[PDB]
Amino acid sequence: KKISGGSVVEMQGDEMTRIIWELIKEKLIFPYVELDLHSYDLGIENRDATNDQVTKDAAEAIKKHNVGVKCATITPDEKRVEEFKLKQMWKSPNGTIRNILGGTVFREAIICKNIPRLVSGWVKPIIIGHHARATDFVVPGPGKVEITYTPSDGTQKVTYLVHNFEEGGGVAMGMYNQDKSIEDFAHSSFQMALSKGWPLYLSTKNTILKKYDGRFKDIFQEIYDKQYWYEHRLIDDMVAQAMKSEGGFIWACKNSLGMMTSVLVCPDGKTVEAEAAHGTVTRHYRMYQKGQETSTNPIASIFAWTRGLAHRAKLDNNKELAFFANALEEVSIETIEAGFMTKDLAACIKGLPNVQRSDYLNTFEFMDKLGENLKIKLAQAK
């Protein structure tokens, strides 16, 4: 009856996104898909109770099962330490997860025909990638700061003057990048393309950091010929090319939030972690706690699930799951395009002072409209 979805790592989160995450599972996922679900509770109280061990176990499960879908989580600050009486200022779960997995983060805004964009010409989305270290120190007083390279065979020594501090002190730092990290960025970028069926654009300073940025340009061109369209451009020339076009390209960059998605793509081409690019929407959660009506956009959170499920389906050659993930993305866009949307989107169209209650749906009404539309779409498909 229901689709056999296979192995998925799910991470529960905090505040308004936690409410939305449960609604998505109950209304959009669980009525259609059965999963061998590896669920980790990354809610702040559980991270505190387990001394953050839950976060490390979730990252290891993503590494083992290749598919991670994560709800937004609170990153503690002093105010959060007091609010929850935390044992310590726990590090960001996203930072912990990224450190364990590695990879490149790709960000993509979901586009709807009736929702204004930065450039009206944008019909197809733009997927921006950045690869995801330094030795800094105080220069106590006058003297030379030099950076040297000694090849391991001892045949040469190259010394570069960083600066001769003559009047006083300051600060200095040394930075590096290994060819393997640049290679991993290139792979993830060509493999983000091919999967999406779009062209790739690499942008660098190149005119300023000629040797550092030149190596990225050279490694990308080399990998494009040996193992794989693709084109390089300067930052200034690139933003101009983005001001034109219908969009629909991957932009590897070396240097409403409710519609912003994020995907971590590991160099292996096997592991993916998807999530909303926004936070826990604390202000809406405070309204919910006071009995006030909320209108929180679930699109970014739904697309974490669809990107995760589409990846799972690709790994397992599961056609029914691949169809479901795509159908849920289309239903989400189509619902908004038919005029049914949350307040943030009504405000993008009308301007916040001109938004009336009849222009939007509350959190629960929007989720119910998506559920009704999804039921219809899948019934007609079979």
CB of residue 168 vs a second copy: minimum separation in angstroms? Answer: 5
Q: Nearer to a second copy by C-beta: 31 or 116? A: 116
Q: Exposure of 295 by Cβ count < 10 A (0-12 exposed, 13-18 middle, 19+ buried)? A: buried
Q: Strand, coil or helix: what is 80?
A: helix
351 is an interface residue for a second copy by CB under 8 A: yes
Spell out the alpha helix ranges (H) of 317-362.
319-337, 343-350
Name which of ligand NAP, a second copy, none residue 94 binds, using a CB cut-off of 5 to 8 Å depending on partner kind: ligand NAP
Which conformational region is residue 143 in: left (phi greater than 0), alpha (psi within -120 to 50 degrees), or beta?
left
Tokens (6 digits) for 72: 């937004």
Angle between helix 93-101 and helix 53-65 axes, rounded to 10 deg: 40
CB of 164 to a second copy, least distance (A): 8
Task: Give the span between the Cα atoms of 70 and 61, in whole angstroms.
Answer: 12
Cross-strand pairs, 11:
40, 70
If contact means CB under 5 to 8 A according to the sort of partner, which of ligand NAP, a second copy, none does residue 280 touch? ligand NAP
Shortest distance, position 119 Cβ to a second copy, whole Å: 9
How far, in Å, are 6, 111, 204, 264 from residue 103 at the CA level? 23, 25, 19, 6
**Does position 75 bind ligand NAP by CB under 6 A?**
yes
CB 323, min distance to ligand NAP, A: 26
- The yes or no reply on residue 147 touching a second copy (CB under 8 A) is yes
Which of 212, 228, 288, 323 forms a contact with a second copy (CB under 8 A)?
212
Residue 27 CB, nearest approach to a second copy (Å)? 30
Which residues 6+ apart lie within 8 Å of 103 measured at CB? 132, 184, 188, 264, 265, 266, 267, 271, 273
Residue number, 202 or 341, with CB nearest to ligand NAP: 341
Binding mask 153-182 for a second copy (x = CB under 8 A): x----x-xxxx-xxxxxxxxxxxxxxxxxx
The contacts of residue 51 (CB under 8 Å, 6+ apart) are 87
**CA-closest candidate to residue 72, choices 246, 262, 271:** 262
137 binds, among a second copy, ligand NAP, none (CB under 5 to 8 A by kind): a second copy
Which amino acid belongs to residue 300? A
Q: Tell which one of 78, 82, 136, 225 touches a second copy (CB under 8 A).
A: 136
Residue 68 pairs with which residues in a beta bridge?
Answer: 9, 273
What the block records as the tokens of 248 is 């629909």
**Segment interacting with ligand NAP (CB under 6 A) among 186-194, 204-212, 294-302, 313-321:** 294-302
Rounded to the nearest whole angstrom, what is the least distance from the CB of residue 145 to a second copy in the complex?
Answer: 5
List binders of ligand NAP among 320-359 (CB under 6 A): 344
Q: Does 297 bind ligand NAP (CB under 6 A)?
A: yes
List the one residue from 36, 57, 146, 293 that touches a second copy (CB under 8 A): 146
First-last CA distance in the chain: 12
Stretch that binds ligand NAP, among 135-143, 174-182, 293-301, 310-318 (CB under 6 A): 293-301
97, 55 Cβ separation under 8 angstroms:
yes
Is-contact 264 98, C-beta < 8 A? yes
Which residues inside 233-292 make contact with ligand NAP, applying CB under 6 A?
A: 240, 257-258, 275, 278-283
Q: Is 65 helix (H, G, I), strand (E, B) or coil?
A: helix
Q: How far is the CB of 311 from ligand NAP (least distance, A)?
A: 19
Pick what 258 binds: ligand NAP, a second copy, none; C-beta below 5 to 8 Å, kind-dependent. ligand NAP
Contact 195, 129 (CB under 8 A): no
227 sits near a second copy (criterion: CB under 8 A): no
Distance, in Å, from the CA atom of 369 to the CA atom of 364, rounded to the nearest integer, reads: 9
What is the nearest approach in angstroms of ligand NAP to the Cβ of residue 85? 16
Interactions with ligand NAP, residue window 195-234 (CB under 6 A): none
3-class DSSP state of 260: strand
How many residues touch ligand NAP under the rule CB under 6 A: the total is: 19
Q: Site residues (CB under 8 A) for a second copy?
A: 118, 120, 133-153, 158, 160-163, 165-182, 208-212, 214-215, 351-352
Q: Site residues (CB under 6 A) for ligand NAP?
A: 72-75, 94, 240, 257-258, 275, 278-283, 296-297, 300, 344
